């Protein structure tokens with residue numbers, strides 16, 4: 001996250017780190033057995049780390065649980081990044097408590113201008129890199145259709161929303177992919193793609209979760 005602030009510890013209890021040797025993408029706990037992430041994060045062995053704040057130190061609230069099933073959306077498209085969404089079933093249920101908690105799926109799609117919170121352990125620098133130990137946070141608004149489509153002509157599909165700031169300097173980046181955009185208590189975006197991070201006139205693009213609630217429920221019920 002570029003231009004963010006350090007989250008208060010355990011204040012985002014639905015945030016997960018996906019790990020294989022090290023952190024590579026985020027995700028969100030949506031019930032005690034299932035995490036949602038980005039399909040472009042797919043790897044075949046994934047450990048899910050819950051209750052994290054500092055990824056570099058064992059702090060004592062963590063639960064580490066390996067993925068048992070990984071299911072990417074059947075129409076995910078690798079150029080266009082349309083349908084960039086993946087579900088992971090844990091091999092046993094997360095224990096829910098104050099440090100580990102689910103986020104609600106959306107009741108409807110969000111209005112333009114709605115403020116949301118974005119979180120993750122991705123890169124913090126435009127210029128150069130610097131992957132943080134501590135979870136970072138960023139408040140940003142859902143941008144209108146117009147502002148999103150004018151930034152990325154011909155590339156924004158009906159399953160994508162833009163969230164952020166046209167001036168640059170605030171955005172999500174590599175390492176945040178897969179992680180949550182929560183607005184008024186509901187998960188409305190997954191970190192997906194962008195041109196660079198925090199570039200003027202190129203806000204982040206996010207998978208539009210309110211289109212996927214049926215697919216998520218049906219997949220959970222069958223698996």
Ligand SMILES: [Ca+2]
Nearest residue numbers: 054057058059
């Ligand atoms: Ca830790």
